[PDB]
Target: Toll-like receptor 13
Amino acid sequence: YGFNKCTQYEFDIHHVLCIRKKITNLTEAISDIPRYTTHLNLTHNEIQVLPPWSFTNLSALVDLRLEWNSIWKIDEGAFRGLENLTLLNLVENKIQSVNNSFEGLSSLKTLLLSHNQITHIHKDAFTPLIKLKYLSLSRNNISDFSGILEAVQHLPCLERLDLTNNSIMYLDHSPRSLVSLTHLSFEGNKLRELNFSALSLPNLTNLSASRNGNKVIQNVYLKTLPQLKSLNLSGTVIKLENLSAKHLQNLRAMDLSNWELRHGHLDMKTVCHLLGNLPKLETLVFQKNVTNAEGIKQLAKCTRLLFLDLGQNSDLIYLNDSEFNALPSLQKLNLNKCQLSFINNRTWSSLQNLTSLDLSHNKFKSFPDFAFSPLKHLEFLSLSRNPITELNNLAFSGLFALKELNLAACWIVTIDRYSFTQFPNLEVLDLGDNNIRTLNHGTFRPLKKLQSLILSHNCLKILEPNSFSGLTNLRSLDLMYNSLSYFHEHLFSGLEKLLILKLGFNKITYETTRTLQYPPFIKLKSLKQLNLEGQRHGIQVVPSNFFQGLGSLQELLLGKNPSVFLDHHQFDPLINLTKLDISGTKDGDRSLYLNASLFQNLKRLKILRLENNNLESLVPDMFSSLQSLQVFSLRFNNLKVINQSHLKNLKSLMFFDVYGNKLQCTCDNLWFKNWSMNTEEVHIPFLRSYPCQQPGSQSLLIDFDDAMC
Amino acid sequence: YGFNKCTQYEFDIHHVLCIRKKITNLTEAISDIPRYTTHLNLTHNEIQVLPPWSFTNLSALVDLRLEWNSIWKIDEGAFRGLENLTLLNLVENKIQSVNNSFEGLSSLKTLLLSHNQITHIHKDAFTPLIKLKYLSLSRNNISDFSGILEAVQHLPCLERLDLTNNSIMYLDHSPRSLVSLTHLSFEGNKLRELNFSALSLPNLTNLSASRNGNKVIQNVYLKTLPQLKSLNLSGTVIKLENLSAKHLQNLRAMDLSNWELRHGHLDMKTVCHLLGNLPKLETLVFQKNVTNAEGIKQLAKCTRLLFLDLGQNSDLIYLNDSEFNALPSLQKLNLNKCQLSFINNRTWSSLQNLTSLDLSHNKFKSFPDFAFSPLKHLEFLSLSRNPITELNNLAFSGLFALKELNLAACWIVTIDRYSFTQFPNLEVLDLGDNNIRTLNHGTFRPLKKLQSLILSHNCLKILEPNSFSGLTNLRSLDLMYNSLSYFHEHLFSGLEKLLILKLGFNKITYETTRTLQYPPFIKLKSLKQLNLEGQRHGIQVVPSNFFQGLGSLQELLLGKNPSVFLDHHQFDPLINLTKLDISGTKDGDRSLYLNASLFQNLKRLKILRLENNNLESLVPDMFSSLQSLQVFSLRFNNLKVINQSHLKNLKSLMFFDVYGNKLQCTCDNLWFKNWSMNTEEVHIPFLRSYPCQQPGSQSLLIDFDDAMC
RNA sequence: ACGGAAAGACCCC
RNA sequence: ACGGAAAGACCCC
Ligand SMILES: *[C@@H]1O[C@H](CO)[C@@H](O[C@@H]2O[C@H](CO)[C@@H](O)[C@H](O)[C@H]2NC(C)=O)[C@H](O)[C@H]1NC(C)=O
Ligand SMILES: *[C@@H]1O[C@H](CO)[C@@H](O[C@@H]2O[C@H](CO)[C@@H](O)[C@H](O)[C@H]2NC(C)=O)[C@H](O)[C@H]1NC(C)=O
Ligand SMILES: *[C@@H]1O[C@H](CO)[C@@H](O[C@@H]2O[C@H](CO)[C@@H](O)[C@H](O)[C@H]2NC(C)=O)[C@H](O)[C@H]1NC(C)=O
Ligand SMILES: *[C@@H]1O[C@H](CO)[C@@H](O[C@@H]2O[C@H](CO)[C@@H](O)[C@H](O)[C@H]2NC(C)=O)[C@H](O)[C@H]1NC(C)=O
Ligand SMILES: *[C@@H]1O[C@H](CO)[C@@H](O[C@@H]2O[C@H](CO)[C@@H](O)[C@H](O)[C@H]2NC(C)=O)[C@H](O)[C@H]1NC(C)=O
Ligand SMILES: *[C@@H]1O[C@H](CO)[C@@H](O[C@@H]2O[C@H](CO)[C@@H](O)[C@H](O)[C@H]2NC(C)=O)[C@H](O)[C@H]1NC(C)=O
Ligand SMILES: *[C@@H]1O[C@H](CO)[C@@H](O)[C@H](O)[C@H]1NC(C)=O
Ligand SMILES: *[C@@H]1O[C@H](CO)[C@@H](O)[C@H](O)[C@H]1NC(C)=O
Ligand SMILES: *[C@@H]1O[C@H](CO)[C@@H](O)[C@H](O)[C@H]1NC(C)=O
Ligand SMILES: *[C@@H]1O[C@H](CO)[C@@H](O)[C@H](O)[C@H]1NC(C)=O
Ligand SMILES: *[C@@H]1O[C@H](CO)[C@@H](O)[C@H](O)[C@H]1NC(C)=O
Ligand SMILES: *[C@@H]1O[C@H](CO)[C@@H](O)[C@H](O)[C@H]1NC(C)=O
Ligand SMILES: *[C@@H]1O[C@H](CO)[C@@H](O)[C@H](O)[C@H]1NC(C)=O
Ligand SMILES: *[C@@H]1O[C@H](CO)[C@@H](O)[C@H](O)[C@H]1NC(C)=O
Ligand SMILES: *[C@@H]1O[C@H](CO)[C@@H](O)[C@H](O)[C@H]1NC(C)=O
Ligand SMILES: *[C@@H]1O[C@H](CO)[C@@H](O)[C@H](O)[C@H]1NC(C)=O
Ligand SMILES: *[C@@H]1O[C@H](CO)[C@@H](O)[C@H](O)[C@H]1NC(C)=O
Ligand SMILES: *[C@@H]1O[C@H](CO)[C@@H](O)[C@H](O)[C@H]1NC(C)=O
Ligand SMILES: *[C@@H]1O[C@H](CO)[C@@H](O)[C@H](O)[C@H]1NC(C)=O
Ligand SMILES: *[C@@H]1O[C@H](CO)[C@@H](O)[C@H](O)[C@H]1NC(C)=O
Ligand SMILES: *[C@@H]1O[C@H](CO)[C@@H](O)[C@H](O)[C@H]1NC(C)=O
Ligand SMILES: *[C@@H]1O[C@H](CO)[C@@H](O)[C@H](O)[C@H]1NC(C)=O
Ligand SMILES: *[C@@H]1O[C@H](CO)[C@@H](O)[C@H](O)[C@H]1NC(C)=O
Ligand SMILES: *[C@@H]1O[C@H](CO)[C@@H](O)[C@H](O)[C@H]1NC(C)=O
Model:
C-alpha cells in the first residue's frame, strides 16, 4: 500500500498527487493507484499523449488535473468510462487543435483549456458535454470566432465562456443563439467591432471587451443583450457616442477605465449623456487618468452610484472642495494609486452612507484634524502604502463604526495609548510592515472588540509590560518577522481568550539550560495554535518549563529552526496537542535533541512531522505512547532501517512517510518491505520507487530477494 | 601528523587550539603536540589541577591560556621549563589562594588571575616573576590589601596592578614604595578612605577609585602620588572639599561622574574651587545628572578643557543659550544619553576648535537651520539613536571639514540627492539600521572622497539606477541585511575602486536557469571580497554568468545559503580567487550542486571550505586542479571514505580537515589512515580522535586492524 | 505573506 | 554587528 510515482493525500485517501515526477508515460504512472480514487492531480510533468483508454480502472474520478504538461495529442476515447468527472484541467499544454476526444464525459461541468496554442475546435468536439457549464479558452491562438461558435452553440448547459487573451478581430454574422450563457469575455483580444446583431444572448449578464487594441470601435450593437448587468470596456478605445442607453437599461455596473494614463481625461459631457440614462447603474469603475476633481463634480450630477472606483487618477493631488457631495448615495469609494497628498472635511461632507473607503498607495504623509469625521458610518478604511510616519489622532475623530483599519506598509515609526481611542468597534487592525520598534503599555487599551491584530514585519525589539491590555476579545495575534527575544512577566496579560499566537522568525533563543521564573505563555489559557518557527539562530535550548499553562494547545510549530533542543519534559503540559511539527533543522544530532520520553503525554497527537532533519537513527520507544498518531512523517532524513520496533503500538497509524531516506536493501528491512506493501491500513508515499542504496542502483527496495535471510 | 584533543591553527602551525573539548587531564591532552608549539589555548575545559611539570615538552611556549576551567590547584613546579612564556591566562577558574608556583616563569610579562575567588597570595608567590609588567586580580574576593602589597612590592618590573571588583575596604598603613607602578585600580571595591600616606607611588600616572559605594569618603590624601595624571572617581562619593589641588598639579584628566542619576547635581562652587586650580587639566568626564546647563556655564569659567564629557546629564533638554561660549578651547564634546530635544547654533557659537561631537542617544526629532554651522572644524559627528525620520539639510550648512558621520539606528525613512551636499570631505557614512526602503539616484553624488558607506539593516528593496553615482573613491559598501534581489543594469557602475561588497542576508535568489543580460558585478574592477551569504531562500540557481568581470576577486563568501546551485562554469572568471567558502547549506544533494569541472580555473585558490553541507560523497577529479590549495576543509559532513582519488594532485596542501565526518573503520580507509598518520606535510585536525562508526563506539580509526586488507 | 506544509521545489510563461 | 569562520558552539557569570 504505496504506489510508485503518485501518493495519496494524508487527510483524504481519495485524493492522489503525482506532482513534479518527470512523468512521461501516463498509463504506467497511474497503473498502481486505487480504483476508489476521486481526485487525481498530475500537474507539472512531461506527458505528451493521451491514449484511447487512459483511465479505464479509474471511473470514480471526479477531478482530473493535467495542468502544465506537454500534451498535444488526445486520442478519441481518451476519457471513456469517466462518467462522474466534473472538472477537467488541461491548462498549459501543447494543444493546437481540439478534436472529438470527449466521449464519456457526461457529467463534466468545467473544462479548462487555458494557456495552450488552440486555433480550431472541431464542430462536434463538445457533443458529449451535456452538463458543461464553464469553458475556459483564455490564452490561446484563436482568431476565427465563427468556428468557436459552431463548437459551442449547441451546448445545453454552457453558462460561462472565456476567450480572454486571444486574437479575435471580428464577431460572427450568421444568426445564432446561446441561451444558457451568462458570462462572456473577449478581454485582451483585438476586436474591431462590438456588433452583436446575429448573436442572441438572452441570458447574458456579464460581458467584457476590455483591452482590445489600438483601433477605435464605432460599430456597436447591444440590443440583443437585454439582460446585461455589467459591461467592461476597461482599456478599450470605444467611441462612446455609439453606445446607446436604450440598449443598456438593465446595466448595473460599467467599467470605462483607460488602458494607460497617456490616453487622458474622458469628455464628461459624452460620459454623462450615456450614464445619466441608465437607471439601474450603481457601480462605475473609472480608472487611469480618466478624470480630475472637477469632472467628479460633473459625474455626481449624471448619476446615483453605490460604488465608485477612481483608482489611478494621477491628476487627483488634493480633494478639499465638496467633490463628492452630490453623491450621497455612495457606499464604497476607491481612491487608491492616485497622487493624493491632501484630503479633508470638505470633500466628503455628505457621504453619511459610505461604509468602505480605500486611500491606499498615495502620497499621504498626514491628514488634518477631523478629516474623516463626516464618515460616521465607515466600516472599512485603508491607508496602506502611504508615507505616513505618525498618526494624527484627530483625523479619525468620531469613526465609531469602524470595524477594520488597514495601515500595512506605511512608514509608521511610533504609536501609543492615544492612537486608537476613536475605534471602539474595531475588529481587525493591520499594522504590518511598518517601522515600529517598541510597543508602549496601553497602546491598544481602547480596542475592546479587537479580534485580529497584525504587527508582523516591523522592527519590534521591546514590548513593554501590558502592551496588550484591554484586548480581552483578541483571537489572533501576529508578531512574525520581528526581533523579539525575551518575554516580560506580564507581556501576554489581557489575552485570556487568544486562540492563535504567531511568533515565528524572531530571535527567541536560549543559549543555556533555563527554568523561567515566568513561563511566557502561562496566561494564554485558550491558546490553540502557537508558531515558533525559524528563530534566527534557532530557539536552541528550550527552557524546561517553556510550555507551562498550555493545556488547550492543539498545534505547535517549531519547524525551520537551525536548532531545537528539548532535553527534558517540555511537552508534558500539552495534553490536548493534535499536531506537532519540528521539521527542517537539517542536521540531526547537532541541530535536534528530543528526550527519550518527550512524547509520553501526547496521547491525543494525530500528526507528527519530523522531516528534513537528516536523522540517522530512531530513539527506541520514543513513539510508543502515541496511540492516536495517524500521520507520521520522517520524509527527507537519513534513516537506513525501519522495523516493528519503531512502529510499536501506533494503533491509529494510516500515513507513514519515509520517502527521501536511505533504506537499505538488506534483511534488516525485510519486515518493513513486506508489511509496507501489504498493510491496507497504512499508506506509504512513493514506496514502490524507493531505491536500493547500492551505488549501481537500477534496483528497488520493492524487489528485494526475500530468499537470502 | 594529527592530534587527539587539539589542533593546529590553519595559518600558523605554532598555534595550537584545544577549545571546548571537555579536557580534564591536562598532561594527557597535550602529550601529542609538537615541541615547536608557541601558542597554546586550552580555554573552555574542566582541568582541575596542574601537576609539577605540566609543560615539560613545551618549553617554546610564549602564550598560554587556561581560561574558563576548574583549576583550584597549581602545584609547585607546574610551569617549570617555561622560560620563554610572556603571557599566562588563568582567568575564570576556581583559585582561592595563590601559592608558590611560578618557578621558571622568568620572562612572564603579563599574568591574568581575574575572575577567580582569590583571598590571599603567599608573600613569595611572585618572586620568580622578574619581568612581570601587568598583573590582573580583578573579580576576586580580596579584602586584605596589606597581604597583596606583601606579594607585589618587591616585583622589579611591575607597572600595572588591577584590583577592580574586589572587597578592599581600607588601605595599608605601613610606609612602603612601589616605584615602578604607573597604573593602579581599586574600581568597584568598598574603600572607606583614600589615604595614601603609607604608600609611595612616585611614578603613578593613573589611579581609579571609581565605584566604591555610597559611604562618603572624607579621608583623602594624595601628596604621595606626585606624578598622577588621571584620577578616576566615577560613582564614588568623596567630600570634594577634602581633595587638595596642591597635591594634584600634574593632573590632566579627572572623572567626577555620579553613580546614579538620583545623587543629583554637584555643588559647582566646590567643583570649581578644585578644578580652577589644576593648571594642566584638559579632560573632564562629568556624567549622570551631575550638572545642568547653567552649571556648564560656571564650569566654563573654572576651566580650560580640550575634552568635556557631559553624557547622561538628564536635565539637559535644550541648549540654546551660549552654554559653551566660554570654552572655545574644546576639541571634543560628548552630550550623549541626555534628554536633548533641541539644540541650535547659539550654544556653541565660539567652538571653532571642536573636531569631535557626540549627540547620540538623545531625543532629537530634528535640528533647526544652521544648528551645526559654527563648527567649521568638526571632523566627527555622531547622531546615532535619535528618533530622526528625516534630515534637515540646512542644519549641516558648512560642515565642510566633516570626515565621519554616524546616523546608525536613527529612524531615517528617506534620503535623496539633497541630503549630503554639505560634506565634501566625508570619508565614512554610517546609515545602518535606519528605515530606508529605497535609494534614489544621485543620493551620494557630492561625497567625492567617500571611502566607506554602511547601509546595512535597512529595508532596502529598490535601488534606483545611479544610486551610487559619484562614489568614485568608494572602497567598502555594506548592504547586508536588506531585501535586495535584482539589480539595475548599471547599478554597480562607477565603483571601479570598490574593494569590498557585502550583499549577504538579502533575497538574492534565482528559481530557474538564467544567463543575465547584465551581470551586476561586471564593472567592479578592483573588487577583492564579495559577500553573498545567507540569502533568505538561498541564492539557489546561480546564473551562468553571475561572476563575470571579477578577475580581481580574492575572496568569495557563499556560505549559510539554504541552497547554492552552480551547474555550469560560474567560477571561470575568478582567476585570482584565493579563498572560497560554500559552507552551511546543510543537506548535500538537495541544497548543493557543483559542476564536475567547476574548479578548473581556480589555479590560485589557497583556501576551500565546504563545511556543514552533509555531503555523502566526493565527485571524482573535482579538486584535481587546485595546485595552490593549502587549506581544504570538509568539516561536518557525512563522508564515509576518503582515499588517494580525492587528494590527487594537491601539491601545496598543508591542512585537510575531515573532522566531524563518518569515516569507516574498513579497508576502504586503509590508504587514508596510513597517509594521514604519516604525512608531515599535511595536518589533519583531531585525527587521533576519529571514532569507528559502530554504534557501540569505544574504538578509533587510528587503531585499525590492517590485517585483512 | 515563498509566512509554500497536499513542502524541500532548477518553480518556466 | 552571534555579521562568531582560529565556526557549528547547551556559549555559564
Ligand atoms: C492537485 O489537485 C488537488 C485536488 O485534486 C488540489 O487540491 C486543493 O488544494 C488546496 C490547497 O492546496 C485546498 O485548499 C483545496 O481545497 C483543494 N481542492 C480540492 C478539490 O481538494 C491540489 O492543491 C493540487 N496541487 C497542486 C500542487 O497542483
Ligand atoms: C474589467 O476587466 C479588467 C481587465 O481585466 C479587470 O481588471 C482586473 O481586476 C482584478 C480585480 O480587481 C485585478 O486583480 C486584476 O489585476 C485586473 N487585471 C488587469 C489586467 O488590470 C476589471 O476588474 C474589470 N472590471 C470590473 C468592474 O469587473
Ligand atoms: C442611506 O442608506 C439608507 C439605509 O440602507 C437608505 O435608506 C433605505 O432605503 C431603502 C430604499 O429606499 C428603504 O426601504 C429603507 O427603509 C431605508 N432605510 C432607512 C433607515 O430609512 C438611504 O436611502 C440611503 N441614503 C441615500 C442618500 O441614498
Ligand atoms: C586561543 O588563543 C589564541 C592565541 O593563542 C587566540 O588567538 C587570537 O585570535 C584573534 C581572532 O580570534 C586574533 O585577531 C588574534 O591575533 C589572536 N591572538 C594571538 C596571540 O594569536 C584565540 O582567539 C583563542 N581562542 C579562543 C576561542 O579563546
Ligand atoms: C566589575 O563589575 C562590574 C559590575 O558588575 C562589571 O560590569 C558590568 O559588566 C557586565 C558583564 O558584561 C554587564 O552585563 C553589565 O551591564 C555591567 N554593569 C555595569 C554596572 O557596568 C565590570 O565589567 C567588572 N569589571 C571587570 C574589569 O571585571
Ligand atoms: C573611570 O571609570 C569608569 C567607571 O568604571 C569608566 O567607565 C567605563 O568606561 C568604558 C569606556 O567608556 C566603558 O566601555 C564601560 O562601559 C564603563 N564601565 C563602567 C562600569 O561604567 C571610565 O571610562 C573611567 N574614566 C576615565 C576618564 O577613563
Ligand atoms: C507506456 O508504457 C507502456 C508499458 O510498457 C507501453 O506499452 C506504452 O507504449 C507506453 N506509452 C507511451 C506513451 O509511450
Ligand atoms: C484494470 O484492472 C484489472 C484488474 O486488476 C487489470 O488486470 C488490468 O490490467 C487493469 N488495466 C490496466 C490497463 O491497468
Ligand atoms: C487533433 O488532430 C490533429 C490532426 O490529426 C492533430 O494534429 C492534433 O494533435 C489533434 N489534437 C489533439 C490535442 O488531440
Ligand atoms: C491576459 O494577458 C495579460 C498580459 O499578459 C496577463 O497579464 C493576464 O494575466 C492574462 N489573463 C489570462 C486569463 O490569461
Ligand atoms: C458580473 O457582474 C456583477 C455586477 O452586475 C458583478 O458583481 C460580478 O462580479 C460579475 N461577475 C464576474 C465574474 O465578472
Ligand atoms: C484646497 O487646497 C488648495 C491648496 O492647498 C487651496 O489653495 C484651496 O484654497 C483649497 N480649497 C478650499 C476651498 O478650501
Ligand atoms: C471639518 O474640518 C474643520 C477644520 O479642520 C473642523 O473644524 C470641523 O469640525 C470639520 N467638520 C466636521 C463636521 O467634521
Ligand atoms: C592523567 O593521565 C596520566 C597518564 O594516563 C596519569 O599518570 C595522571 O596521573 C593523570 N593526571 C591526573 C591529574 O589525574
Ligand atoms: C616528552 O618527550 C619525551 C621524549 O620524546 C618522552 O619520552 C616523554 O614521555 C615526554 N614526556 C611527557 C610527560 O609527555
Ligand atoms: C626562547 O626565545 C628566544 C628568542 O627568540 C629563542 O631564540 C630561543 O630559542 C627560545 N628558546 C626556547 C626555550 O625555545
Ligand atoms: C594553595 O594551597 C592551599 C592550602 O594548602 C590549597 O588549598 C590550594 O589548593 C592551593 N592553591 C593553588 C591555586 O594551588
Ligand atoms: C593617613 O594615614 C596616616 C597613618 O598612615 C595618618 O597619620 C594620617 O592622619 C592620615 N592622613 C589623613 C589626611 O587623615
Ligand atoms: C591613563 O591616563 C591617560 C590620561 O592621562 C589616558 O589617556 C589613558 O587612557 C589611561 N590609561 C588607562 C588604562 O586608563
Ligand atoms: C537630577 O538631580 C536633580 C537635583 O539636582 C533631581 O531633582 C533629579 O531627580 C535628578 N534626576 C534624576 C533622573 O534623578
Ligand atoms: C531656548 O528654548 C526654549 C524652549 O524652546 C525657550 O523657551 C527659551 O526661551 C529659549 N531660550 C533662548 C535663550 O533663546
Ligand atoms: C584653537 O586651536 C589652535 C590650533 O591648534 C590653537 O593654536 C589655538 O590656541 C586654539 N584656540 C583656543 C582658544 O584654544
Ligand atoms: C544661527 O541660526 C539662526 C536661525 O537659524 C540663523 O538665522 C543664523 O544665521 C545662524 N547663525 C550662524 C552664525 O550660524
Ligand atoms: C590578479 O593577480 C595578478 C598577480 O597578483 C595581478 O597582477 C593582476 O592585476 C590580477 N588580475 C586581475 C584580473 O585583476
About this structure: The first helix of chain A runs from residue 26 to 30. Residues 414 and 436 of chain A are 6 Å apart (CA to CA).
